[PDB]
Design a protein around this ligand. Structure first.
Ligand code: WAS
Length: 765
């Protein structure tokens, strides 16, 4: 029955708009298969279209906003694009119809509505782009009755081993199609839908924009050749309408020109299913999907006071839909340095200069291919997997569809190498590589990243302890299924644990360092003078200079998080030899956090180094780092240390702003310095951890109960209102929030762990 549920999940999740890097497009969870993409742009002149056309996601002054209004990857949803430049408000509805043996059918409706500023007679070019990779697969446009293009629907017939037999139809659609009186209409028609079928080597099929432009250019070249000129030029839109040449190939370009408002549909019909999909089907399923989404939202994200109002409900649906609608499928090679140069060991003073020299050797090579199914921090700026981000993305996703979250964990864990390493950024394939400068593509097997995915696993364990509806929860309703999942995953968690202890170990025994355990001390590899990218907290101030004797209290705390889950899961599997080892490490970390990291003087945790004169020195920068033992759930509810941290969190002159907890204290010398990334702004992921821990203390007998209750209440309020006010004003979730003004700054469309705000509002942790 475990294998049964796995097959049902496979079939359920196969199709999706799993191309978050573009406004709109579909692909299935198969590396080499069928992919679709939407392009549009107004055409007003002979040279404007190339600047107006939209394809990959961006955010600038010309695009007001975009995102999913509702989305469930099992069913589909609706996306809204608000394009100032092209004067267009676009709707893309996408829906899945289960059936057959090949992962079902789907349909999309693309609807374009001119805004008020647009000339009533704007010409808009719309392109649907279709590609198929594979050695033994086929795809063909059925030619039209008419000479020059299509009066009605365009039918593509294809086949592959992955998908079997299928048909993809691009319907005729509603809207005025402009007509030309030019001479040229005698050879190119007066204006009609057109198809060009082409073939390129598989590996470049993804470059839709250049492929399309290469065709437009050849069209124009043909004009110049055949004596069409400025004596008497055809209208711009006709100059950019391709000559109709349907046939067979691995690329098919469907082009339409509309005057005024438009709509058309794409229907993908799996032949192995019932009868083929119709437009009337699409409308039904769209309506049905909405109802289903609505009802689930109210059960799963039941917003509590003072956020019960409809305004906060629209806000919640927007934050949730955009996070889950980021889910993508990636496939291809990664760029890894597998030299393991000894300089990466970072054992010397000045190691950063060594490791730069090792990097300058450039021994990195492509390897793979790999696949990943994952949600993403930002469609326009970060459309790929990020290790510790995913930990946060999956927390609300898990509430919604636990089986989906587990799928994404499985996907992530399947990437882990024999050593136990997973790269912190997953850039798979040329398409993903295309948005990342070369200098930043290379992953390093010594670079770790917070194991935030353990948090999601914790939520699963506690739920396990105490047809789409059925599938979404199958892994908790069927305990044998739950356990088998953990059984298969458990070894890899353990490998990761050990990998941490091997590669990220700090130096106790070689120094004048007294402490309860000789084993337990951690230092992030990869740090520069200015940065510690691997910790997640890029420029949070650390010991200067960096030094092989550093210990990092955040890293040690993460280790604690892992052991606690390893205990929980190990128990469920009866791996007693293991569970006993874990307990001794937990015990040691608890003592060692105190022995090595606690400053009695400052009243918080700190990172350590080694002096000019070789003694252990604590270095305190009051901020997120300082609270780590608390945020990660390691301190007992009656601890005096905890009480002292509650004082720190509450203190307006340190961390507590009207807008949330500041990343760094206003008292710290490093406040608001350098790039001021993690040196003062309010970050929702860390605020979320605090809100959760405060709630724990608040709902449990103890000395800090009512102080925590007070902080919980006010912090939940502050964080939600900050993210909400900004959403109301700007349309966007932001990466971080300004502690002085409350304004969102840095990356937009950050959904992204900012979306955790849905879980904060709904509460009852
Ligand atoms: N002006 N542009 N400079 C610039 C510098 C470096 C790079 N490439 C390194 C790839 O890493 C990054 O993206 N940047 C670090 C920012 N990290 C943020 C966000 C996130 O990393 C993902 O949400 C979280 O995980 C981190 O916790 C959080 O601190 C690029 N680039 O174009 O890729 C551009």
């Amino acid at each position: 029955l475990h294998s049964e549920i796995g097959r049902l999940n496979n079939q359920s999740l196969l199709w999706g708009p799993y191309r978050p890097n573009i406004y709109f497009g579909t692909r299935p969870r198969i590396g080499k298969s069928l992919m679709t993409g939407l392009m549009w742009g107004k055409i007003e002149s002979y040279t404007d279209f190339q600047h107006t056309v939209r394809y990959t996601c961006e955010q600038n002054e010309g695009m007001k906003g975009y995102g999913w209004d509702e989305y469930d990857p099992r069913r589909g949803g609706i996306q809204s694009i608000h394009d100032i430049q092209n004067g267009l408000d676009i709707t893309t509805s996408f829906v899945k119809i289960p059936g057959g043996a090949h992962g079902g059918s789907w349909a999309a409706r693309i609807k374009g509505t001119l805004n008020d500023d647009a000339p009533k007679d704007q010409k808009t070019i719309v392109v649907f782009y279709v590609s198929q990779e594979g050695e033994n697969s086929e795809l063909e446009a059925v030619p039209s009755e008419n000479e020059f293009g299509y009066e009605g629907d365009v039918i593509l017939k294809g086949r592959s081993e992955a998908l079997g037999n299928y048909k993809l139809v691009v319907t005729k659609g509603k809207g005025v199609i402009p007509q030309s009186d030019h001479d040229l209409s005698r050879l190119r028609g007066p204006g009609q839908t057109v198809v060009q079928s082409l073939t390129y080597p598989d590996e470049v099929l993804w470059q839709a924009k250049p492929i399309l432009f290469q065709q437009l250019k050849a069209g124009i070249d043909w004009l110049v050749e055949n004596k069409y000129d400025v004596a008497d030029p055809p209208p711009p839109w006709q100059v950019y309408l391709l000559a109709n040449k349907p046939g067979s190939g691995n690329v098919h370009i469907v082009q339409k020109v509309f005057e005024g408002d438009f709509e058309f549909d794409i229907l993908f019909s799996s032949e192995s299913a019932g009868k083929e999909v119709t437009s009337k089907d699409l409308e039904r399923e769209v309506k049905q999907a909405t109802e289903v989404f609505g009802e689930r939202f109210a059960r799963v994200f039941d917003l509590k006071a003072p956020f019960q109002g409809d305004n906060y409900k629209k806000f919640g649906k927007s934050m949730f839909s955009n996070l889950i609608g980021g889910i993508g499928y990636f496939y291809g090679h990664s760029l890894v340095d597998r030299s393991y140069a000894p300089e990466y060991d970072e054992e010397n003073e000045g190691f950063w200069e060594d490791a730069a020299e090792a990097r300058a050797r450039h021994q990195e090579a492509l390897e793979g291919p790999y696949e990943l199914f994952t949600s993403i921090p930002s469609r326009p700026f970060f459309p790929r997997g990020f290790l510790w981000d995913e930990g946060f993305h999956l927390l609300p996703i898990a509430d919604w569809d636990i089986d989906l979250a587990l799928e994404i964990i499985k996907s992530w864990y399947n990437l882990m190498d024999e050593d136990g390493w997973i790269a912190r950024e997953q850039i798979l394939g040329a398409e993903a590589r295309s948005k990342v400068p070369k200098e930043f593509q290379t992953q390093y097997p010594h670079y770790a990243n917070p194991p935030t995915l353990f948090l999601v696993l914790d939520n699963f364990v506690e739920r396990l302890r105490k047809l789409d509806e059925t599938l979404s929860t199958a892994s908790v309703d069927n305990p044998e299924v739950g356990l088998e999942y953990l059984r298969r995953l458990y070894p890899l968690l353990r490998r990761q644990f050990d990998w941490f202890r091997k590669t990220q170990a700090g130096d106790i025994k070689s120094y004048d360092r007294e402490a309860y355990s000789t084993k337990e001390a951690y230092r992030w590899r990869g740090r520069t003078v200015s940065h510690c990218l691997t910790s997640g907290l890029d420029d949070y101030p650390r010991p200067q200079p960096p030094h092989p004797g550093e210990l990092h209290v955040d890293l040690m705390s993460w280790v604690g998080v892992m052991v606690k889950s390893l205990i929980s899961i190990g128990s469920l599997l009866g791996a007693t030899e293991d569970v006993e080892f874990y307990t001794k490490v937990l015990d040691a970390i608890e003592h060692n956090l105190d022995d090595l990291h606690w400053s009695e003087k400052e009243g918080c945790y700190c990172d350590a180094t080694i002096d000019e004169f070789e003694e252990h020195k604590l270095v305190c920068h009051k901020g997120y780092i300082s609270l780590f033992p608390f945020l990660t759930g390691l301190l007992k509810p009656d601890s005096p240390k905890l009480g002292k941290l509650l004082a720190l969190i509450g203190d307006e002159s340190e961390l507590w702003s009207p807008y949330g907890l500041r990343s760094l204290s206003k008292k710290d010398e490093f406040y608001g310095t350098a790039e001021n990334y993690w040196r003062s702004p309010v970050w929702i992921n860390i605020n979320y951890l605090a809100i959760v821990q405060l709630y724990n203390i608040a709902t449990q007998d103890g000395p800090y109960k009512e102080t925590a209750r007070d902080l919980y209440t006010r912090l939940r309020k502050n964080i939600v209102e900050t993210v909400y006010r900004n959403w109301e004003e700007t349309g966007f979730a932001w990466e971080q929030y300004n502690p002085e003004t409350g304004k969102g700054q840095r990356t937009q469309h950050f959904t992204g762990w900012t979306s955790l705000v849905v879980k904060i509002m709904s509460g009852h942790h």
